[model samples]
Target chain A: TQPTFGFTVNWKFSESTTVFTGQCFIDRNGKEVLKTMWLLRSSVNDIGDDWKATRVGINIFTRLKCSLTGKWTNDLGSNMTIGAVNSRGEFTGTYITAVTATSNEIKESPLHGTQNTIGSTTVFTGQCFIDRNGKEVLKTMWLLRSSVNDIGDDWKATRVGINIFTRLSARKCSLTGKWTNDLGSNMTIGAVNSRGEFTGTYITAVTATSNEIKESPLHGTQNTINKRTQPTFGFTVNWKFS
Target chain B: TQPTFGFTVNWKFSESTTVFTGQCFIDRNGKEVLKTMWLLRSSVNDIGDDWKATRVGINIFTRLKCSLTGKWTNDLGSNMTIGAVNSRGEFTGTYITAVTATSNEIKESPLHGTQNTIGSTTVFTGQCFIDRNGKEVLKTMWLLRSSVNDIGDDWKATRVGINIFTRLSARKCSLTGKWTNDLGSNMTIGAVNSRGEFTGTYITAVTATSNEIKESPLHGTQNTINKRTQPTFGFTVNWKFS
Candidate 1:
């Protein structure tokens, strides 16, 4: 069976009649999927009116999947097609409706939607869920305008997104005793949640033969693990069933 | 027609035995109905051993019909019965449930839907709902605990919930123009959001002769109609919906 993957896009509006674009890739496994190569273009503007203005903007993304073969990829919006992608893995002159606003810019096409603004900038932030058909669809967008006089006057954009494997296998292991070293004071380690993310802070420190770790003011408890070089910690983590 | 009102109680563990003992009152038209008292004790503890030490609680609610009239009477736990006429009437009681390792003494009740904590001193906070059948229900309650702990637990109960109305109304209005005093400084006001809640620090002040009233630093420009008062200087500002 072939591998499966999914991608999503988010846009926020800062001003009226302004547009931004972004993209990502997905690979599918026997029922599992992975994400790769993500691209993001922020603050795309057409100076003149529709059909008269030229498009000027910046694009940034990463490349990973194609270079790592079977390994997992965490590159967001990297290997992207500028305008659009066709049936033959080629670029079609038309651009995908990755991001669009409710302005009159695309009056006759399908990418027309409402616009809203955020702070002093026009941003388009949202997500699009892709099905098996591989069609370019517009899920959500943010369109914002300060005032009628502020439209199409000045434009700015920024691109940022995260990439990681949405699906993975589950595993289990056993832990014994305390681990420590020199140069480090204390350590704290823990497992990730359903989303595979972990966060913690350091506690105390102790020397090689001497056991002495500072206590935490918040918990009023002494650190159990200490190290002179680097502190060691443990987490009550859980692995996913998938 | 009679107005109907009721509240729901939820039990996290269905197999735990629980008991709720309290009194309730109903409001008829502009008068209070029969002040009824009740005691409910349920036990599902035999269903499973896992729920033997689980948490259990209760909720009591009463309503009134417009057709009721005259005085209402009820027993106050003891055998003695009490009656009241057109005067303001009240109902009150207390409840306690078994605790668990994860349960804190200052935790909310699991049975009643109210987010109120029971104090460590074995005392439970009480809530009073006025105008039960009226268009708006005024609610007030306090959570009190014994100051037996190191945290100086001897203080009076802290106020938990206090709401003038059941539902909040939204109304946004804009402030108008410049107001000047006998002296020279001019002041400009803005608009306020649906709730009449405005916060911010003052950049300008009003004086006896000449002064300005700017927005407060608390709200950070999110609200209008900021107020600044000087004993000798006062101004009546105007506002319109935007």
Candidate 2:
């Protein structure tokens, strides 16, 4: 089963209020369901009154566009509808989340050659939530042959190793991590065609350990974390399920 | 958890001491478990008689190279010792497998504005074993896909809808069929990416029903098939927990 995710995200935070608009598609069951969503966030920076200007204020007036558009997320919570924007479909609801950090890297480790160009980054933290859905979706990923000189029938001549993990909390957490502080994952060479387009498979576990949790509002009381891994694995080839 | 397989294969079927060499690396546990090995086979397709011929003749003497190398298997049974090669590893045992037909294809089904190309294939049957594993292991899998696009970010703007299955048998049957007829596996779109690469999620189950069947020795047994639908789905993207 080859699944993909596509969506556009833009944010404009002016002072105490933050506005976000996202359009996505839950490519599931062989159907492309269009989901248009938006978010309104209110942050409490609380700089305190000790100074001349009392309240801790933040004017997030700049625009940020998530470099990731055609990325995948688990069915976008099944029904990609994060409220805040009174747009199409019904307003599922509103949510508050910490602006978290995200990082992704792709390094080429050839078997007989050198194809290592690692591209990675993290946003430290951001607010995330589903928008709405119906039809209307949007746009492209980056373009390349991985790189230029890195092109070949590497699918049969090279090898690729990848990994991912999530960072839940200091200890017991959820929305965990993937490909964290490790090699991440491993997979055979992808299906490389005449065009530099390559698609491959993943041979690692996106272990979901933070299934259930408890919060002490004031702080956190530790217990144990989850380890029942999800036996999930699939394929990703170049272009066509290549 | 997603795992991929990419490797190279070569064979020399001399009707008698059929020799085969396979080089692969299983991308597992974020490690590349390299398995470079070979196989020498003896078949019933030999010609040794009192006059002219004695066995079902099938002289396979050819020099051809398959384009995939360094793929993987479940630890390659743990050790990388193949019984035939005199290179880089030890020779453990020798086994023979049936020589059958294999077919592969690459096509362009842009799946709408989705510039996705798909390539896939299958063999009626190829002998696969290692029953010698610590604990007996068994299973059957059928595969397919497409290739060569006429290029684009098949990932961002395109969609790939691929479907595959196994050649299972009825209680009284053997190696049945899948992807047989009637647009066999539905395809409305595909998943495309940029890097000549792409990433998206897919949500379709590996249907486990006699949606259709072929191949049987005796007459066709009379019994309706079972189709309750397989409840499973997931994602297919490039380089995450790659």
Candidate 3:
């Protein structure tokens, strides 16, 4: 569907010594959607680096004021997805809109799209079941070694899966299981909220170098549920000098 | 001195598209000194682009364990730079040693590196003092616009300067003021200790997206104080994802 209202950003980076530009999208459509989330590169510079890139537009399920039943219909469709009701009595979910992937439209595939085409490109999608909670300790299990073997990007593995991240707002709950990509598979167990907020206490989020983690009150913003987007506010990973 | 014994690593990234990478470092001389902190490319393949290509490396101050009188001389020098000591008693300072601005080495004009070697290749040196502690907040002020004019890499900012970070085990002190870089410059003011652990409770670290703040124990970790050399262990800025 045509973006009812959202903005396009020129996602740039200086990670690989060489400066780089990637596309970023914030979809205000159904809650908030990820038309094309670019999982950047370090050494590779093909604008579209797999293992370093994804051709999917991951989307977020919007967040609402838990004050009511929190049930609502989609502007594009009729099926209302359910949100996990918190002890605080709030409801959230990715309400469906009648929008379908058009041949020439930007799609919603998380960590899936980040190449040359905005309107016409092959894409993938994921169904984020916000039925969650954590902090207790959020764990993101990345699929490093996919089950199969193919030169998807020739960067490394076959296909690096999306962040099977944790659920926020949850003190206890998870969509526990082993998810996989074309190459390997992994799991993410945490307190990921509808807005994609991760509040893992013991272990917030875990990655390779993350024997620890990142910063900022600049922190990072995520509209798991947005009107049209899920662009990163600032949260970065750089080596700072004192 | 010339890295008598510090092993550096290649730092890389994917510009925050669920941006993730494991760790790659060995136990350097005393701590971990990155020989090559690779700032990566996102979308683009060549690794060097515009902001795409800022030719320089920004480093953190080394750690050296500040104890007792904390007033000692350098193996290469004679006096210690005093920290802005607090009543609690944790000294801190970016000291100096017997190193000169040897034209062939990289320098620390803070906001000074990132390209045509400023006025030709070589640079200056710094003396890193070690006075530690923190379970605090850390905040970094980033330079959006430049004190000058220029285009830079998207690690964020034209000149993403130093993390005007504070000392957690701090005696309640700071580095103060505004810092900048050719591309951009900023500061990180948070709950960072001598060991380089960001455990800020207040407004320690800052990023673009984080609304509530960073991850668990997901905080950052560094060793400004070391057996021989100090290095940054792990520090990240996650997606507010919530």
Candidate 4:
């Protein structure tokens, strides 16, 4: 089936970020509009295990018009076939993880999943893993949809992933510099640790005669300890006066 | 300032659709990834209060580079000046809702909002409304960010909006047709109401000798009532036999 319309939008804030992805279609007024839902990520703030926080919301989107993308071969020499998604966002396929050498017997198990349409991309969640008795073991697969122009450009897929948070080489690359806002408030960072924690001083622009110089202590953290991108950081002013 | 990164994705199911929008930056892995939130919309399932159900999620997006879009003049002969976004996703601007009558007194109110960046599109939620006593009234505005080449193209913004669900000419346009799935299951619908409620009969393909013809009652709903796209529908087979 052809890929339908949808869009994903992100809204980032200091304490949290909200992402809204949904369907895009012509409304009653012939205006192309988006009906979407959002997710928020922030500090869960749990005292015991406070790594990250994820909260989902109720929302909407349109069907996807793209095709399933991936080479169906795993490292274990398993063969898999993903069928075309029907109008109901449902697809059934087959997968085989083993082949008998003595009898040359080949066995295939039915794999079915629901296609989730995001933008032009589709993330498929399939019942892929089963035990010897054909009982459910693990059910998951993420397939990035392919576009027409760039059919399989940057296609991504994974199952049962692992997330690792390693230490960064903070001494070489750090946010230890002077930053200023559009309001002429200056911020000077001293050092950044592997946890992205840092201390700084903030000073408001000094006025000629009407106003006096104001200084405040600043402390904040970067978005991540690892990537080399311009991370978004938030700091507290600890202002003593207005 | 340059544009940061983010991505928005949508997941469309039968009953409702979920849209996830948020930031994309290098996480701790030096891996360019997404951290987002979601929203869900479904049938509120209230007797008289079932227009649309929207529930937002708590989550997260990255900063935006692209500039603000639109020529900032309204029908009220007023002007608006939106400033650059700061590191904290905050921006300060000036909006003169009323230019002047006789003395050309261009009174401006401070318009400010946090910048919510979704997939490079920045949705600016500004405090664009106020009363005479500097009191809060309506503070709203949505600004679509500008890309590099498509800069200022397809940018959208609005405030104090109205949602209208008008009647369609059902006689000319309808979803009254036959549908089938990948499994060769056939479905026939007679007519579709503006409310999108419909009844149909689903028939499974008759096999030669081992299988007999099976028919079941099917009931379902479409994702929308007004759009002319291939709407996603779900129906229960109402299977009487195994």
Candidate 5:
């Protein structure tokens, strides 16, 4: 059986700026329908500094609001196969879109896309799950350590994972967790998850900056929900190897 | 003989939003300058909605640092008076700083003083001028329009003006302006006025929905003489005041 895929193409305007330009195609009944959208930048440049692209985009979906559901196959890019969703909201079709290998295009490999680093800091890119609000919900657990040795030390001991969510609306939620290392150092992780909330946490025993926590999943997970009342569901961690 | 009445007053903050309860004194020739600041309201609950009063108690002395040869004045209310400064950089032994009025104080001048109007639209605000580093210089102008017309025009205009220069170190040399009208029309004024170097006319004209000019003096002016490149000065008129 052929695999299915979906494709979303994003353009980086600057170091911290990004624009979304993509086409969604789905097989309906037996015909193919295409929906295209362009996401523009929204932040004003009042501070005289040209809009520098950050990890965020100022605006999204500038034009065209076509919601197409189709089945897709994740095969064009390495480790990054496009998954097609059928009109029935299920993975039931193959994404036949051709793949292009430009400097900006994602390479054909999982966790092998373009890398962004600063001095001793490194950001590893990988296939991730994004929610309806265009926020990263989950990503491949990868090591982003300052020193190469740090990666080996941690990778040999425990697998690290990260989850990121953005509060696009107003809601109330809480996070609770605890961690431990083979070493004597104790670790903790906690956060307040809410709509329109901007926060971060870590699983390290030492004090860490919010930026560090936000960039490193090994640092911790952030699950934010909107609404005045907290959700009744709770999250538990289960680690197993196949 | 011209009666030389001068006083210097140092304004200290008692609360983040309110003025200090104790008297504010000025320093003249290293001598304690005796003076008092007043919190005058035009009407009960009437707060001037312009740049002049909204940022009350915020020192604006650095705004004059460019020349060290100018004077400032404010005379809109009983407790409102502009502090005087001489060519020698000496403050006119007196300063009349204004304070945010309490409910009781606004009662006496309820019709004339500051009135907290619910849904009273902000006529003008968020205008500013900045320097190369994007620091605000000079002053900010904000205007709010009340539903009740003090001039029998069906709407009353409130103004809050704030001078940005007081402490030199915090000076970034920027300017801003904002204007709002009863009809939901709005405009913004902004520019960067560097030391001894001024930008050209940075003005905004707001016309009514009927496309008629309803206000005059809807302009801004600034001058500087420092050596700099050809200053790009221009005006952006959002509307024509008929």
Candidate 6:
């Protein structure tokens, strides 16, 4: 079973909100559903706003499938093969990253992690290189989670046992195209590598005061496993001026 | 109501475990108890192990009282006043940290946060200095959570609008003394300031090979609100040798 998730709904005023922590699972109909216990608090002093016996609720959730479930390769020529993720959001896989270029006796290790589809983004974590000593061998990928504001937008791994993976056919469904937002600002994503890493730039519409179009450096990763020309992607842009 | 908490129990084996996420609040008898939804998974492939209708459970939890519920002061000679925490671990307080030491027209603002007593540590977060612009004034306290492995051992505030507070009379219940662990290693805590910050040294027993005792710097904060000499505390020590 995967871990439970937390959600807050501010249905009333901004000061009032209801917090729900729940789990999602697939039913016999193959539909994903969420069962949660919530606590609604209108104000800070509302001691009665708690997870009482009557506060439990069930919500029908759309089946959240993992997109990081296929054979993939990274920029360093490492191959990763992940199996299907269950409705509980747990997945198992195998990864074969080169330990040393000279040694050809490298073996694939079992990979295990969790995935959760949150809003418009689907995030997944892959734990690999579990040696016999029960210690992780891929120390270089253990980047601090605090460095990145949103981990889903980047391929960087966190210090916690996590590694980002992509699809082997990601190059075919490249994000290398010009895109525009509803606000009329335009963005251009460059060529995506085999590992799905890419760099590009974005230019916003001219500002009223500066009368200049702001430009930003865009960087992101393609983590789609579906076989389609247009695929889902995550990107980051550091704007020079707001 | 307080937010739900997460817990993992690896009862069967290290590889097998059950995850429980739930909320705790006081009952009619003034006792705290937790009602949680649990999911038990034996292995990665156990997709059926989820929060089904019959998988829920209740746990008996001790009333987790907040120790930061009192009048406190900082090293900079400012005052903070907090109220009693409800059984749900919600507390409201007031803080009056000096914006400018020369200004006598300072005012106390509403402070709101949550508390959870995890084992030997009772962690808390205080949100203060909410101006009409709805921005926090105390920015220096917002430290990175990744800096310290255990946040309860330090008074450093996190970037997520959190500040650390201690009892104003904490100086009377000084942590300055000689302490020893069950391993026979000894520690010495220095004088604690009004803000509960202290510095000292910790020395371990002689090593088997080197036959030398190892000493390390000890820094911590006293965050006890109870009326007792031996109040709870949190400290940190960076070891030069394991």
The local distance difference test score of each candidate is 0.20, 0.18, 0.23, 0.32, 0.22, 0.34
Q: Write the candidate numbers in order of decreasing lDDT.
A: 6, 4, 3, 5, 1, 2
Best by TM-score: 2
Tens-place lDDT digits, model 3, residues B77-172: 423333343332222333332332112332211010111101111111111123333322222211111111111111111212222232324333
Error of 4 at A59 (Å): 18
lDDT of 6 by residue, A3-85 (tens): 33333232211222223333444444654443333322222111121111111112223322215457755333445565786
Computed on C-alpha atoms, the DockQ of candidate 5 is: 0.01
Q: Which regions of candidate 2 fall more than 4 Å away from where they truly are?
A: A1-242, B1-77, B80-173, B177-242
Residue-wise lDDT of candidate 4 within B171-228, one digit each (tens)? 2223356655332446576676554545556565522113343564444334452342
Fnat per candidate, as a fraction, reads: 0.00, 0.00, 0.00, 0.02, 0.00, 0.00
Clashes of 2: 78
B231 Cα displacement, candidate 5 (Å): 5.6
Error of 4 at A42 (Å): 11
Off by over 4 Å in 1: A1-19, A25-90, A93-106, A109-242, B1-168, B172-219, B223-242
Q: Which 10-residue window in model 1 chain B sums to the lowest lDDT?
A: B230-239
lDDT of 3 by residue, A144-220 (tens): 21111211111111112223333235432233322333222222333434533332112213222223333201111
* RMSD of candidate 3 to true structure, Å: 21.5
Interface RMSD value for candidate 3, one decimal?
15.6
**Cα RMSDs, all models:** 28.7, 24.6, 21.5, 26.6, 23.4, 23.6
Ten contiguous residues with the weakest lDDT in model 3 chain B: B117-126
lDDT of 1 by residue, B3-105 (tens): 1111111123221112222222233345433221111112211212111111111122222122222222222211111222122111111222232222234
DockQ of each: 0.01, 0.01, 0.01, 0.02, 0.01, 0.02
Q: Could you give candidate 1's per-residue lDDT for residues A1-242 as a string of tens digits?
A: 11111122222222212233222222323122221111222222221111111111222233322211222212222232233322212121112332332232422111111111111112222111122343212121221112112111111111111111011111221111122322122323244343212332333331111323233111000011111111111111010110
TM-score of chain A of each: 0.15, 0.18, 0.21, 0.27, 0.20, 0.28
lDDT at A141, model 5: 16
Superposition error at A230 for model 1 (Å): 62
